Ligand binder design. Structure first.
Ligand SMILES: Nc1ncnc2c1ncn2[C@@H]1O[C@H](C[C@@H](N)CC[C@H](N)C(=O)O)[C@@H](O)[C@H]1O
Ligand SMILES: Nc1ncnc2c1ncn2[C@@H]1O[C@H](C[C@@H](N)CC[C@H](N)C(=O)O)[C@@H](O)[C@H]1O
Lengths: 224, 224
């Protein structure tokens, strides 16, 4: 009967930005219901790693077999591997430049995008992945994408980054989830690509921004 | 008296390619004797991680305070963090292209260079680092360096990669160590930059290649 409740929530949540605690929203989705997750998480250090492990394990349950979860982390690999999710590849997001010019280290203009896939009974898989759909510029493990400087959210990623993840791992109609939706970049990208979307966030402020961002965007696809 | 023996070995080993087991060679160097390590390690998976941890812990002992060890790994971060070495930054070596065009993943033309520094009493440090000595092209966390396709060694890294590590972390006369010297790329780069060098490897074949490579190179600096 929790199956029936989760399925009911899935239909009620489809193509919605839902103001809700991230873990609570994930716990209300059915097993094997989500084809693609694109998200960048927010924020005790041991408590935080415990919380993120609960997030990743719930993502593993709700991912379809062969689904993908792209997790943009702002030693992360140590705790990220303790998860039911199987780390498939680490993508390098090259932002081009950084305001941090502190010369104690090399200029840190790189963020990681961890590409996870679903593990069934502790066994591996190959994710649904269509690299041919991308321009040559984005077929490599480094994506050169300048930050979305016009976005009013304090910390988003650009739409084209979401589009790459979604277009290669989904068909039209498939459900794309972002459990930390923020300004809704993942949801707009899914909608522009004729995928279904679902966002969780705790900001009613960000939900309204998405609803207004959704109205004024003309479904433009930044890719191609 | 092991101090005295190690110091004697250090003088005997300086500016030499020494055919010797890597761990044994490291165990014969004194504490706080090496300013810079540049190396790419070779090769049971649990046994291998145990072996590499012994290598890294010995490197931590022989590093000078504020010294640097650049470790090119061909979830590595999980076991790499269990070490006495403190991971300082992960550098992205962008090789430009790969022959592996398998479309199950993004083209994997990236290798990691882990920048470690010495930990004293489980406490951090800032490594000696002079970023200003580099051309702008290499001041960022991604280094775009095509592979040394003319090198007959089955798996080297290019000289310019070694030069970047050495030039930013050393003064002339400082000792540069590569405990897996192979063709001797690290040693040639140190010599061309008027640093001292020390290599360990088990191939007498590779030692001879270094001795002949050393003679025919004109100490050319690929940097600048
Ligand atoms: N416990 C939580 N549950 C759900 N959302 C949360 C929680 N804590 C923080 N958030 C949201 O997580 C988001 C993290 C953002 N970096 C995401 C930005 C988003 N990827 C974008 O492109 O706009 C913020 O918008 C927070 O409001
Ligand atoms: N136990 C060992 N001790 C020392 N050297 C070893 C050991 N096992 C393998 N090697 C060497 O480790 C090297 C690894 C190479 N990838 C290094 C290449 C080197 N960085 C270059 O640019 O030429 C090989 O040349 C092996 O001969």
């Amino acid at each position: 009967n929790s199956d029936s409740f989760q399925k009911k929530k899935l239909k009620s949540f489809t193509n919605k930005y839902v103001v809700l605690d991230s873990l609570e929203g994930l716990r209300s989705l059915p097993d094997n219901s989500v084809q693609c997750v694109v998200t960048s998480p927010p924020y005790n250090e041991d408590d935080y790693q415990k919380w993120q492990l609960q997030i990743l394990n719930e993502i593993n349950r709700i991912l379809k077999p062969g689904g993908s979860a792209f997790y943009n982390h702002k030693p992360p690999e140590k705790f990220l591997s303790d998860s039911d999710l199987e780390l498939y590849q680490t993508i390098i997001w090259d932002r081009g430049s950084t305001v941090n010019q502190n010369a104690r280290y090399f200029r840190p203009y790189v963020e990681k995008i961890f590409w996870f896939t679903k593990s069934i009974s502790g066994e591996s898989t190959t994710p649904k992945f269509h690299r041919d759909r991308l321009p040559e510029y984005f077929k490599g493990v480094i994506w050169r994408i300048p930050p979305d400087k016009r976005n009013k959210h304090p910390a988003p990623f650009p739409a084209i980054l979401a589009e790459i993840c979604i277009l290669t791992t989904t068909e039209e109609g498939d459900l794309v989830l972002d459990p930390f939706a923020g300004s809704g970049t993942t949801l707009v990208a899914a909608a522009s690509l004729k995928r279904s979307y679902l966002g969780f966030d705790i900001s009613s402020k960000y939900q309204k921004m998405f609803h207004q961002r959704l109205a004024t965007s003309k479904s433009k696809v930044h890719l191609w």
